[PDB]
Design an enzyme around this catalytic site. Sequence first.
Site, mmCIF file in Angstrom:
data_model
loop_
_atom_site.group_PDB
_atom_site.id
_atom_site.type_symbol
_atom_site.label_atom_id
_atom_site.label_comp_id
_atom_site.label_asym_id
_atom_site.label_seq_id
_atom_site.Cartn_x
_atom_site.Cartn_y
_atom_site.Cartn_z
ATOM 1 N N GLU A 148 25.412 -2.480 -22.857
ATOM 2 C CA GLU A 148 24.786 -3.701 -23.353
ATOM 3 C C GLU A 148 25.702 -4.909 -23.260
ATOM 4 O O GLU A 148 26.807 -4.867 -23.767
ATOM 5 C CB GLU A 148 24.297 -3.545 -24.786
ATOM 6 C CG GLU A 148 23.301 -4.619 -25.175
ATOM 7 C CD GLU A 148 22.574 -4.313 -26.458
ATOM 8 O OE1 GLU A 148 23.111 -3.544 -27.278
ATOM 9 O OE2 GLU A 148 21.464 -4.848 -26.647
ATOM 10 N N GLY A 282 31.666 -2.573 -31.846
ATOM 11 C CA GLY A 282 31.731 -1.844 -33.106
ATOM 12 C C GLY A 282 31.007 -0.522 -33.019
ATOM 13 O O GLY A 282 31.498 0.497 -33.509
ATOM 14 N N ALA A 283 29.843 -0.558 -32.375
ATOM 15 C CA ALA A 283 28.968 0.590 -32.209
ATOM 16 C C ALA A 283 27.824 0.189 -31.292
ATOM 17 O O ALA A 283 27.539 -1.008 -31.140
ATOM 18 C CB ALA A 283 28.427 1.049 -33.550
ATOM 19 N N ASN A 286 22.681 3.489 -28.317
ATOM 20 C CA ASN A 286 22.139 4.330 -27.254
ATOM 21 C C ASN A 286 21.229 5.403 -27.858
ATOM 22 O O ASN A 286 21.669 6.180 -28.711
ATOM 23 C CB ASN A 286 23.262 4.988 -26.457
ATOM 24 C CG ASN A 286 24.359 4.019 -26.077
ATOM 25 O OD1 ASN A 286 24.130 3.055 -25.345
ATOM 26 N ND2 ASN A 286 25.567 4.279 -26.562
ATOM 27 N N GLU A 319 22.770 0.971 -36.810
ATOM 28 C CA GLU A 319 22.474 1.631 -35.540
ATOM 29 C C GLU A 319 21.227 2.501 -35.632
ATOM 30 O O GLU A 319 20.476 2.625 -34.663
ATOM 31 C CB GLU A 319 23.681 2.441 -35.044
ATOM 32 C CG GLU A 319 24.979 1.640 -34.877
ATOM 33 C CD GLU A 319 24.815 0.351 -34.079
ATOM 34 O OE1 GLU A 319 23.994 0.296 -33.134
ATOM 35 O OE2 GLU A 319 25.521 -0.621 -34.390
ATOM 36 N N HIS A 322 17.984 0.547 -35.131
ATOM 37 C CA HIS A 322 17.687 0.240 -33.742
ATOM 38 C C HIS A 322 16.826 1.294 -33.061
ATOM 39 O O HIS A 322 16.129 0.989 -32.091
ATOM 40 C CB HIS A 322 18.969 0.042 -32.948
ATOM 41 C CG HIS A 322 19.575 -1.322 -33.088
ATOM 42 N ND1 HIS A 322 18.928 -2.472 -32.690
ATOM 43 C CD2 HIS A 322 20.789 -1.712 -33.545
ATOM 44 C CE1 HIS A 322 19.712 -3.514 -32.910
ATOM 45 N NE2 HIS A 322 20.849 -3.078 -33.421
ATOM 46 N N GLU A 341 18.545 -7.457 -33.173
ATOM 47 C CA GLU A 341 19.747 -7.542 -34.010
ATOM 48 C C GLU A 341 19.515 -8.024 -35.436
ATOM 49 O O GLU A 341 20.178 -7.554 -36.372
ATOM 50 C CB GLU A 341 20.833 -8.374 -33.326
ATOM 51 C CG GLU A 341 21.288 -7.837 -31.971
ATOM 52 C CD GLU A 341 21.842 -6.420 -32.013
ATOM 53 O OE1 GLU A 341 22.148 -5.899 -33.107
ATOM 54 O OE2 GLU A 341 21.981 -5.817 -30.930
ATOM 55 N N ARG A 808 32.883 -10.764 -24.359
ATOM 56 C CA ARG A 808 32.614 -11.682 -25.471
ATOM 57 C C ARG A 808 33.794 -11.862 -26.410
ATOM 58 O O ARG A 808 34.038 -12.975 -26.874
ATOM 59 C CB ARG A 808 31.300 -11.403 -26.226
ATOM 60 C CG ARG A 808 31.239 -10.134 -27.048
ATOM 61 C CD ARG A 808 29.894 -10.039 -27.754
ATOM 62 N NE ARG A 808 29.907 -10.757 -29.031
ATOM 63 C CZ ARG A 808 30.134 -10.197 -30.221
ATOM 64 N NH1 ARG A 808 30.359 -8.889 -30.322
ATOM 65 N NH2 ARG A 808 30.131 -10.947 -31.319
#
Length: 875
Positions: A148, A282-283, A286, A319, A322, A341, A808
Amino acid sequence: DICPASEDESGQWKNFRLPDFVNPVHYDLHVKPLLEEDTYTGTVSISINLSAPTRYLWLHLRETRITRLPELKRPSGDQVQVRRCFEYKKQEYVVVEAEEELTPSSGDGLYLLTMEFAGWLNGSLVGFYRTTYTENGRVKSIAATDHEPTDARKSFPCFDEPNKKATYTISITHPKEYGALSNMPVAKEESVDDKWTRTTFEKSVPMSTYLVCFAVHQFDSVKRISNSGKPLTIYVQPEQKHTAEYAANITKSVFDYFEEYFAMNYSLPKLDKIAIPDFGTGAMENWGLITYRETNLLYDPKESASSNQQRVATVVAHELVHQWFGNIVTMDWWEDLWLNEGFASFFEFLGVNHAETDWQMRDQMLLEDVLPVQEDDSLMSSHPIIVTVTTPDEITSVFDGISYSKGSSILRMLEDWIKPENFQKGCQMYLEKYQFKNAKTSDFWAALEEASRLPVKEVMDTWTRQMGYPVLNVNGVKNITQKRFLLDPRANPSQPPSDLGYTWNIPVKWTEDNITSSVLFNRSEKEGITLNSGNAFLKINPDHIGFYRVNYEVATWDSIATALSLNHKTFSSADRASLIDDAFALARAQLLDYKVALNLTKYLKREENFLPWQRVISAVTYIISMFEDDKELYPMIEEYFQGQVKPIADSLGWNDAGDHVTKLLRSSVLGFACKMGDREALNNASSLFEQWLNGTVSLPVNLRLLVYRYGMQNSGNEISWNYTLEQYQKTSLAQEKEKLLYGLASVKNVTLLSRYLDLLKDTNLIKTQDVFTVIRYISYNSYGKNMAWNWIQLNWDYLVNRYTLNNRNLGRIVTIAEPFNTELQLWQMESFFAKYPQAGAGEKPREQVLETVKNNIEWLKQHRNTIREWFFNLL
Ligand SMILES: *[C@@H]1O[C@H](CO)[C@@H](O[C@@H]2O[C@H](CO)[C@@H](O[C@@H]3O[C@H](CO)[C@@H](O)[C@H](O)[C@H]3NC(C)=O)[C@H](O)[C@H]2NC(C)=O)[C@H](O)[C@H]1NC(C)=O
Ligand SMILES: *[C@@H]1O[C@H](CO)[C@@H](O[C@@H]2O[C@H](CO)[C@@H](O[C@@H]3O[C@H](CO)[C@@H](O)[C@H](O)[C@H]3NC(C)=O)[C@H](O)[C@H]2NC(C)=O)[C@H](O)[C@H]1NC(C)=O
Ligand SMILES: *[C@@H]1O[C@H](CO)[C@@H](O[C@@H]2O[C@H](CO)[C@@H](O)[C@H](O)[C@H]2NC(C)=O)[C@H](O)[C@H]1NC(C)=O
Ligand SMILES: *[C@@H]1O[C@H](CO)[C@@H](O[C@@H]2O[C@H](CO)[C@@H](O)[C@H](O)[C@H]2NC(C)=O)[C@H](O)[C@H]1NC(C)=O
Ligand SMILES: *[C@@H]1O[C@H](CO)[C@@H](O[C@@H]2O[C@H](CO)[C@@H](O)[C@H](O)[C@H]2NC(C)=O)[C@H](O)[C@H]1NC(C)=O
Ligand SMILES: *[C@@H]1O[C@H](CO)[C@@H](O[C@@H]2O[C@H](CO)[C@@H](O)[C@H](O)[C@H]2NC(C)=O)[C@H](O)[C@H]1NC(C)=O
Ligand SMILES: CC(C)C[C@H](NC(=O)[C@@H](O)[C@H](N)Cc1ccccc1)C(=O)O
Ligand SMILES: *[C@@H]1O[C@H](CO)[C@@H](O)[C@H](O)[C@H]1NC(C)=O
Ligand SMILES: [Zn+2]
């Protein structure tokens, strides 16, 4: 070589965006890593739904090369003549030109495209990569992916856009000592040699490319079973097995909480979690294989802090959210990233709230997201929630405070307005409607508009299609007027151009004498509204539930200060934090006299709650920061605030006692005491530090960080620095390592900080994932503020080469210049920026830090005397 680069624009591949008429259905992907060589190869076959006459087929690829001239199949099954392959670098495409065009897939038949590629496992934390760790003295390997947002294309050639959802069947040929993991469970394992194994995974549900993940590892596992009867397992290094326990508990509890709340089954038969020893974010969510940085997954109750516990719980919660918002329902395009997000950032707090009941999580949203992003979103160089992105660098940049925190904040406001029960059901219908497809923001409004019949699109568009937020100005006790709130009073409030003209439809809540009332403040009420008896005080925006600030009349503010001095408990913990937070922001923006704001701090000797202290400390840190080098003001502010925390700091003491929130309070309150120069707090730190150096005494978990920091700052020398450096190497727990790194950044010694900076180039000592963390810690040090700043300049080429302009974190590192406040420092920044004008993902951060530094300069000019007066007169 094969498939070479060409500067040919005459074709649709010159478009940044992929064509509408080419759509993948299924991916057949095989990869074979040569772990010890840092290389891999693979073949991929992709079934393609063609919709229009085209002589060319193109898709994304970066760094990884094509090795065999690709092979295309007609829908009937026949082989298609291919003239050429070529790379178009400008838009990261590999294109293949067929001899002479072909025909849409009219039936159930599809084109099939097969490509052979070779890539690297070294020198990077994106795509497919290898990293190492040590176990019983042996260097071991683990390989994983991270995609990502635009890194799937590094791993293997693909249609690398979130809406080009396809189904996946992945296979991996690896040495037998290793296991292989992916999104789906194992289907079959077959011996290639007596040395190699070929692991084939079962067919995935349709999913976006960025979610596709695989790993090759020799990790142990800690196991749990959902209420669904599905295996939830965390993979972890054997030496670290014990530290996977907590993440296992929270995964179970929050998985079970969510599947119920969303009224929808988790779409996969299993879910795995694994922390890669070197991991760039951070994480990463997937689907069925969530990857972590160790600090965000691995927790030791005997060594880790409550801070760490809450972090692990939150990231796991995040996570997990998501798996519904992001995985099942994905945004159509990155401009709608907040749909992923913001939803995860919002629901994370509900997840962990279920798991841990006395954590006051719902309140903590104010500290973690709401109030911090109100600082961010008061700048001219903010951006609306729905963000126009046209390059990979622009796309990666928007993983930021706006998408996460403002996303989270406007959902929080939306829920309270529309009411939880209906917000719940509306999210449920959105989820069943767009399952395995892509949504736009428009769709989520319509989904909730079917759930409340209220004007959701009309109201929420104002919060979403323009940057910024309003301040409500109170006239009388009861008339309110709205106006854009900008930190810089000189800035033009109508810029950048907005169709909505920077006015909002504000859901407004207020407390009249313990009773609560609601109103929607229409944009078209150009001359404000009046709030609907016999009233003397009106508490607007309770618990800071709305994404706005309230500027009461000065008389009211004065009366609030007095009321706090007399009985602060009159206001809720949140309301205090919110009033304190608004006032200081209003003062900063030249909308309220600083004397008024400061007056609100007078009660603090009796303050005992976490929330108000956090927002006080935030506000003071800035003011203190701006006067760091002012020998006149600084001691006075130090002396004052030292006196205001002392009672609570003394009351709580240097010992791990009390519930979660108390323990968090003690941390920030003792730290502030130290920061403010309390001799007795500093001595506690030094004493504990000296004992820790004696090699046995295990420090109280919630005090460690402070002890390493202030202990090193006050009594650190080369002997204790060296020792701390060894300890950092020796400990397996990443959460401890990170504290020790902060310790090491705290030494008041140029020579030692210089050695530390040099270690950044040494990957045996500092992991690639930690470089930016360390630079940031050093920048906090009174010597290192300028050392880190100078080092990133001198070593800019080195950093860009190592990380790429698309990284980033590299883009964000210039924010270490936030404390700068002179024309001299601004000129330095501007000079460095003009020397390296290609900013990549650093373009927005540059704009932001520049605005901030300019604001700082103006701030000092406007407010020095006033703040001086207030402190002088008081002491
Ligand atoms: C860790 O910090 C503690 C403060 O939070 C220190 O403990 C304090 O030490 C002070 C000085 O020894 C004491 O001051 C006394 O305060 C009382 C008022 O209650 C006055 O009467 C006395 O005049 C005053 N001192 C003298 C010498 O007369 C504090 O009472 C004392 N205890 C508390 C609970 O605050 C620890 O010393 C410090 N630890 C280390 C190792 O430095
Ligand atoms: C909101 O802030 C106001 C502005 O600071 C406060 O009003 C101030 O109260 C001070 C008393 O603490 C006064 O300070 C005095 O100033 C004179 C010089 O003019 C000195 O001689 C005195 O020594 C000094 N007092 C002390 C203790 O050193 C100020 O006179 C006064 N300022 C103004 C402009 O009126 C308000 O009290 C405050 N409101 C609250 C807390 O509700
Ligand atoms: C991974 O390692 C390879 C091999 O060492 C790197 O490729 C080398 O790149 C340098 C110049 O950058 C050349 O001098 C070598 O000749 C290259 N060797 C080969 C075999 O290609 C590669 O760049 C590394 N990957 C990353 C992402 O840094
Ligand atoms: C994970 O959950 C278990 C219970 O589901 C937690 O509780 C432990 O187990 C026993 C009995 O179940 C308790 O009486 C103990 O207090 C717990 N600790 C130990 C060491 O046995 C366990 O604490 C949870 N894991 C965490 C917090 O990491
Ligand atoms: C603390 O650690 C450093 C690094 O291990 C010690 O080593 C010296 O470091 C400098 C460079 O920083 C080298 O040029 C010297 O050759 C090193 N000395 C050696 C290898 O013996 C340093 O001596 C240590 N100091 C203490 C007091 O332990
Ligand atoms: C910062 O650290 C350096 C490194 O230890 C200190 O320099 C040492 O000073 C001692 C005593 O003067 C000598 O024994 C060592 O030989 C020096 N080491 C090196 C590498 O030069 C320095 O004094 C410290 N500076 C401050 C301001 O604390
Ligand atoms: C609790 C979260 C805020 C932790 C956060 N992780 C995420 O947001 C993941 O869901 C992101 N999807 C991972 C990510 C982060 C940045 C750029 C690209 C991708 C992170 O810091 O990596
Ligand atoms: C959805 O979950 C329910 C209850 O847990 C289960 O009975 C059902 O089989 C699931 N639906 C599927 C797998 O399609
Ligand atoms: Zn996320």
